[PDB]
């Protein structure tokens, strides 16, 4: 759901903020973003694996 | 597409409209921020003398921007050029200060 | 005839494929009387193609 | 003459030059890495290193 806001896909989730400007991100930018989305959840739920 | 021609022999310098007309440095304009962010040093040499004491209004379309606000005593003198020009000299091809 | 050499068929090129470069012949008159030195993009070290 | 050339050898030297020019450009174009444009110049292009 979060990568579909900054990238372009055909998966419909409802476009909850569009007035904030961004770029049509490619795979490297989306992977860097998804790594932070990963490590925030790992840091909060206290996982290591 | 904004190309700037200096006025020769006392003419006013001009800049290109999106339609195709050249216009002088007066009035009310509308920018995307990408124009300035392309030309952040060329436009400072051209426009900062006209914004400060002349008659030029520029509306820079952004959508979103973080802000830092200063307060002033309204019983005193207050001039915001040393903040405005400090912002305009620092917004750069990658980033933007608040 | 018992053992001959082998040719080098596969060879890779990583740079941009061209053979026609553009050479400057004379210099340009950037400090001049008529226009000020602020018109030229060479005064700001803007890289041009 | 160090700087002289026979005018009856011009076609032989031109075909000399063309054969060297064709034999030099026998390579294969190689894929290298890419990078997303963070500057606002292009509208999110994929530029190559």
Q: What length is written for chain D?
A: 49
CA distance B56 to B45: 15
Distance CA B42, CA B1 (A): 14
For residues A9 and A36, the answer to whether their CB atoms sit within 8 Å is no
A25: which chain D residues are within 8 Å (Cβ-Cβ)?
A: 36, 44
Residue D38 to residue B42: CA distance in whole angstroms = 21
Query: Residue written as tokens 């050249």?
Result: B22
For residue D36, the cross-strand partners are D46
Q: Which residues pair with B22 in a beta bridge?
A: B16
In this structure, chain A runs to a length of 49
- Contact check, Cβ <8 Å, D21/C19: yes
DSSP codes of every residue in chain B? ---EEPPSTTPPPEEE-SSS-EEES-EEEEEEHHHHHHSTTHHHHHHHHHHHSS-EEEEEE-S----------TTS----HHHHHHHHHH--SS----
User: Which 3 state secondary structure label does DSSP give C43?
Assistant: helix
Which residue from B13, B33, B32 is spatially nearest to B23, judged by alpha carbons?
B13
Of C39, C41, C44, the CB nearest to B6: C39
Which residues, including other chains, have CB under 8 Å from residue A17's CB and lie 6 or more apart?
A: A5
Mutate to test the interface with B, among D40, D41, D43, D44 (most CBs of B within 10 A): D40
Do the chains C and A touch each other, judged by at least 3 C-beta pairs below 8 angstroms? no
Q: Which residue of D has its CA nearest to A26?
A: D36
Cβ of B38 and D41 within 8 Å? yes
Grouping H, G, I as helix, E, B as strand and the rest as coil, residue A29 is: helix
Rounded to whole angstroms, the Cα distance separating D10 from D17 reads 10
* Interface contact flag, D39 B34, Cβ < 8 Å: no
Chain C partners (3+ C-beta pairs within 8 A):
B, D
Work out the number of other CB atoms within 10 angstroms of the CB of residue B25: 19
| Closest C-alpha among B63, D44, D41, B32 to residue A21 | B63
Where residue B63 falls (left for φ over 0; alpha for ψ -120 to 50; beta otherwise) is left
């Amino acid at each position: 759901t979060l990568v579909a806001q900054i990238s372009e896909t055909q998966y419909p989730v409802d476009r909850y903020l569009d007035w904030i400007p961004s770029l049509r991100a490619s795979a490297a930018t989306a992977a860097t973003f998804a790594e932070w989305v990963n490590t925030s959840m790992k840091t909060a739920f206290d996982l290591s694996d | 597409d904004c190309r700037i021609s200096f006025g020769m022999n006392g003419a006013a310098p001009m800049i290109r409209d999106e339609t195709g007309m050249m216009v002088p440095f007066e009035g009310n304009w509308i920018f995307p921020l990408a124009l300035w962010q392309m030309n952040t040093r060329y436009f400072n040499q051209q426009f900062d003398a006209w914004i400060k004491t002349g008659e030029l209004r520029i509306r820079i379309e952004m959508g979103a921007y973080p802000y830092m606000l200063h307060y002033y005593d309204p019983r005193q003198y207050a001039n915001a050029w040393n903040l405005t020009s400090a912002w305009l000299e620092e917004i750069t091809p990658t980033s933007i200060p608040s | 005839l018992l053992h001959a050499d082998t040719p080098r068929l596969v060879t890779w090129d990583a740079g941009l494929c061209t053979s026609f470069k553009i050479v400057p012949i004379v210099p340009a008159q950037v400090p001049q009387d008529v226009l000020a030195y602020t018109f030229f993009t060479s005064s700001y070290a803007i890289q041009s193609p | 003459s160090v700087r002289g050339a026979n005018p009856l050898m011009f076609r032989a030297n031109v075909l000399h030059m063309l054969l060297e020019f064709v034999l030099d450009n026998l390579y294969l174009n190689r894929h290298t890495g890419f990078s997303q444009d963070h500057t606002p110049f292009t509208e999110g292009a994929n530029l190559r290193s």
